[PDB]
């Protein structure tokens, strides 16, 4: 009966928690206590990218570490040449309420979506001189919160309804649907080998998915409120999540447990965007208090502060070569830091 | 300095900037509004009337054009979104106003409507965003009050001790009891409004029927008022 299934679920959860406690012998703080702190980190604003009419919700760096796509609520994607602050393209959108954007690894496509419930994919390199909508993907019943490219023909989208989906771009249809969340899915991060990906939802749980099979390998529940951002460690064996409980948490897939928490007594606003550095020694996390902090991912010590925005930081992206960190906010300015 | 191709790249960027300037005028001369309500509230009738008078299966947002005195207006409402609202409501903190249509002739879901209005009003991101509530379906309210079969006293105990405010202006001439009831509903919403406003945003009551043709004018007057007040705070007059 339903009571029997409920009791079975409770027993399974208890068994899982007992196993997780069994695998816990020394906290990462103890094993890291004997390394040199990174010391104070000062980063300066190198470029300010002006031109966006309204607040910016998303950004994505290019794999060439020079091009940059930015999305704003006024209904535009602007592709910036970060070195010279030139504008390469200005793509007008049908729906102005765009709140995700991605830049294809090959550099041929850019995707965007939002409250329109459609993941629109744009072709940058056409025989004509303009950028055209290659194809619009429909099928999500909620807002599209994040989308990421696996190759030029596959895209992974997270949506307002409790569902992620893997799309074929040539044939609009969904190849696989990922279900299991009990709340809105807000973020998404692909593994470096592009075989696994994690999604953070509004149920205070993060799940690691299997792209090929389509089943949830593990579920991570340590947070106290909804998760706003998520990103893989460059190893492929960890990820960090920022939630509305004003804390960032680092999980491990192999231990399947929460390692370390980055919290401060002063900080009460929630994290809105989380990104690692190349080595993973730094964990840059945006906040609602207009400032982005830098945490030592191994020691939970606040190393630096990136304070240059007159409104909340909505997006945050570290480039592939590690030379720069880009930050977008609701004041319609992007900033390249170094 | 910089080579010929870089000259041409900068010139293309300048062309893009000029196009962006043209967009800005239209973008800043057009006022955006968010339409909210329940399933029973006649907001579909309001949007149909506004679309007719002036100016794709799982789509999540619908957009409406209308123009009053050579001033443009956008009116969005959410179509496919789920019942949970705390995440996508943040995208609408720069709108001129929020239009909250509520069905005043239900008496049963009206407490849920009050709770929804309370959540909208006290939202951390929807501060400095005023609300234009349309206490819709007034003719059904009149019919149901004059019928007498269903009473408001049992849903809201405080109605027995309530009395009509002196500022009420029943224009056409109707039974005073329906006027008392409708002003009681308005005062409940206004109580939730004035509990914790702090003067950053206001609430504009209006009694409307879905057939009424003054809704566009009424939104225009309210939006004019909001912009004026905002301008006062912006030009350092208060």
């Amino acid at each position: 009966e339903l009571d029997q299934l409920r009791q079975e679920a409770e027993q399974l959860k208890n068994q899982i928690r007992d196993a997780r406690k069994a695998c816990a012998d020394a906290t990462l703080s103890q094993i890291t206590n004997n390394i040199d702190p990174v010391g104070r980190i000062q980063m300066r604003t190198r470029r300010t990218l002006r031109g966006h009419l309204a607040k910016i919700y998303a950004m994505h760096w290019g794999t060439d570490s020079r091009l940059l796509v930015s999305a704003s609520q006024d209904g535009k994607l602007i592709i910036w040449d970060s070195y010279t602050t030139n504008k390469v393209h200005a793509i007008p959108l049908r729906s102005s309420w765009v709140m995700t954007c991605a830049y294809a690894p090959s550099g041929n496509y850019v995707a965007c979506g939002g409250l329109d419930n459609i993941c629109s994919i744009y072709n940058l390199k056409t025989r004509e001189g303009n950028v055209r909508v290659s194809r619009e993907l429909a099928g999500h019943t909620g807002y599209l919160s994040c989308c990421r490219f696996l190759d030029d023909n596959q895209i992974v989208t997270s949506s307002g309804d409790t569902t992620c989906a893997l799309w074929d771009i040539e044939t609009g249809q969904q190849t696989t649907t990922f279900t299991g969340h009990t709340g809105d899915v807000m973020s998404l991060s692909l593994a470096p080998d592009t075989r696994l990906f994690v999604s953070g939802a509004c149920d205070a749980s993060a799940k690691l998915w299997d792209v090929r099979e389509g089943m949830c390998r593990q579920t991570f529940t340590g947070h106290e409120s909804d998760i706003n951002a998520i990103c893989f460690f460059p190893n492929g064996n960890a990820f960090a999540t920022g939630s509305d409980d004003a804390t960032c948490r680092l999980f491990d897939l192999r231990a399947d447990q929460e390692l370390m928490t980055y919290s401060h007594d002063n900080i009460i606003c929630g994290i809105t965007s989380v990104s690692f550095s190349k080595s993973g020694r730094l964990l840059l996390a945006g906040y609602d208090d207009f400032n982005c902090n830098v945490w030592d991912a191994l020691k939970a010590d606040r190393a630096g502060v990136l304070a240059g925005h007159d409104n909340r930081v909505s997006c945050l992206g570290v480039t592939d070569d590690g030379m720069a960190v880009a930050t977008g906010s609701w004041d319609s300015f992007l900033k390249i830091w170094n | 300095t910089l080579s010929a191709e870089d000259k041409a790249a900068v010139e293309r960027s300048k062309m893009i900037e000029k196009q962006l300037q043209k967009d800005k005028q239209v973008y800043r001369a057009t006022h955006r509004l968010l339409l909210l309500g329940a399933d029973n509230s006649g907001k579909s009738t309001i949007v149909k009337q506004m679309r007719i008078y002036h100016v794709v299966k799982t789509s999540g947002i619908f957009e409406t054009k209308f123009q009053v005195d050579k001033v443009n207006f956008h009116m969005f409402d959410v179509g496919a979104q789920r019942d949970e609202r705390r995440k996508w409501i943040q995208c609408f903190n720069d709108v001129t106003a929020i239009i909250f249509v509520v069905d005043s002739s239900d008496y049963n879901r009206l407490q849920e409507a009050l709770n929804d209005f309370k959540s909208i009003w006290n939202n951390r991101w929807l501060r400095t965003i005023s609300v234009i509530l349309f206490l819709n379906k007034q003719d059904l309210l009149a019919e149901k009050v004059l019928a007498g079969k269903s009473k408001i006293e049992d849903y809201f105990p405080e109605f027995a001790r309530y009395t009509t405010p002196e500022d009420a202006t029943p224009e056409p001439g109707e039974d005073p009891r329906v006027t008392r009831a409708k002003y009681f509903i308005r005062d409940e919403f206004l109580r939730i409004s004035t509990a914790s406003g702090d003067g950053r945003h206001y609430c504009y009551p209006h009694f409307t029927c879905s057939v009424d043709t003054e809704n566009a004018r009424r939104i225009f007057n309210d939006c004019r008022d909001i912009i004026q007040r905002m301008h006062l705070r912006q030009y350092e007059l208060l």
Partner: single-chain antibody, 229 residues
Framework: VQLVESGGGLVQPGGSRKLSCSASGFAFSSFGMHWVRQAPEKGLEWVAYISSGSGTIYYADTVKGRFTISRDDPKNTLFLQMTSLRSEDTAMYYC??????????????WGQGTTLTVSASADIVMTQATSSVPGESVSISCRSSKSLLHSNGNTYLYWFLQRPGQSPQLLIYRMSNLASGVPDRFSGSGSGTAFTLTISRLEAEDVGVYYCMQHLEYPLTFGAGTKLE
């Protein structure tokens, strides 16, 4: 995309003629455009360039005052008004399409050309090797008077192939990037002054004249070009 231009014929010396280039199939207003000509038996030579939005107009030294260039975006045509035609203007005028942003491919498309006949300093000199050279591998070479490497990191060298009937089509841009549609056989290399173009497996359609280009500074000189047979 296509660029059809017309307006050529016999003209008495000292006369005037207007050449128009009708464009269709691409976003015309966003493409800067050039005019390139070649004498009945000589190499190509740059004439004029009009930018996107008509804000930057350059002319070659030999036509500095005689010609004027203009475009009509709504009508989607490109003009070249010529006045006082000398006898050294007999050529086939080509209509060239070029765009400029980071990563772009200038000079990607060329027009068919018009036949025009007239009755009886510190610029980069591009010098080609002897103008005569299946399954084999050829290594057409080139040289420049001034280093084509810039502080940006891009060396502006362009390779063009002209087959016997058609107008030239781009093969390599910025000496390393294969143009869209060119087979993987072609590849380019160089060091700043000397450059080479290599065809790994020559085929029947690879015969023609190979012209090079510099795009570091105006005017854009070409070079005589090498003939494969």
């Amino acid at each position: 995309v296509q660029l059809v231009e017309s307006g050529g014929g016999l003209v008495q010396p000292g006369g005037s003629r207007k050449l128009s280039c009708s464009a269709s199939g691409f976003a015309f207003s966003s493409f800067g455009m050039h005019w390139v000509r070649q004498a009945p038996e000589k190499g190509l030579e740059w004439v004029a360039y009009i930018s996107s939005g008509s804000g930057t107009i350059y002319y070659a030294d030999t036509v500095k005052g005689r010609f004027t260039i203009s475009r009509d975006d709504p009508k989607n045509t490109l003009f070249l008004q010529m006045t006082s035609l000398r006898s050294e203007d007999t050529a086939m005028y080509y209509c060239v399409r070029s765009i400029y942003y980071y990563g772009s491919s200038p000079f990607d498309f060329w027009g068919q050309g018009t036949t025009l006949t007239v009755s009886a300093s510190a610029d980069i000199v591009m010098t080609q090797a002897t103008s005569s050279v299946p399954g084999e591998s050829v290594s057409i070479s080139c040289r420049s008077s001034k280093s084509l490497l810039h502080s940006n990191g891009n060396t502006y060298l362009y390779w063009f192939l002209q087959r016997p009937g058609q107008s030239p089509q781009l093969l390599i841009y910025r000496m390393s990037n294969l143009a869209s549609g060119v087979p993987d056989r072609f590849s380019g290399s160089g060091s700043g002054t000397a450059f080479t173009l290599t065809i790994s497996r020559l085929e029947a359609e690879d015969v023609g004249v190979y012209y090079c280009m510099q795009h570091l500074e105006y005017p854009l000189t070409f070079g005589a070009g090498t003939k494969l047979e």
